[PDB]
């Protein structure tokens, strides 16, 4: 059994990574320039785009790539580090609003996680929560089109 999303961890932080098109992508504000661990020693990032808060390593063992969305839908679903699924209506290129706002804590540690269209295909990487007084109502995400061009 292989997973598309890996729960990754730094000394100071913990967050998600998502494998798409054979690359393990996650947020720069979590990974920095770090190598990813492997049973043969550290592996250096394949891509680094600080402009877009995006980095990628080669996809690790135990992983399986997501397919990029191509149906344009606006009904998204964010998957959290707890495997919770959260419906998110899309507003713009990198913005989406939670159909049911949640405490900020509920999304904590999930940046790097996937935003799925109705077909389970990747629309973007969860970048950051948009909060009013501890209540997340929307999210920013790195559109998967950015991933595809960054390659």
């Amino acid at each position: 059994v292989e997973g598309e999303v890996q729960i990754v961890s730094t000394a100071t932080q913990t967050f998600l990574a998502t494998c798409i098109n054979g690359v393990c992508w996650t947020v720069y504000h979590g990974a920095g320039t770090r190598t990813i661990a492997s049973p043969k020693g550290p592996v250096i990032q394949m891509y680094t785009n600080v402009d877009q808060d995006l980095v990628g390593w080669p996809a690790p063992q135990g992983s399986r790539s997501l397919t990029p969305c191509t149906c344009g839908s606006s009904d998204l679903y964010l998957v959290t580090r707890h495997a919770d699924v959260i419906p998110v209506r899309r507003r713009g290129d990198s913005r989406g609003s939670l159909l049911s706002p949640r405490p900020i804590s509920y999304l904590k540690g999930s940046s790097g996680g996937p935003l799925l269209c109705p077909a389970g295909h990747a629309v973007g990487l969860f970048k950051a929560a948009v909060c009013t007084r501890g209540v997340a109502k929307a999210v920013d995400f790195i559109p998967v089109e950015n991933l595809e061009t960054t390659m």
Partner: peptide, 16 residues
Amino acid sequence: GSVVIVGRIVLSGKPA
């Protein structure tokens, strides 16, 4: 320090 993988999520729920 390296980013380490501490768990995996399978989107389809596929059992081992």
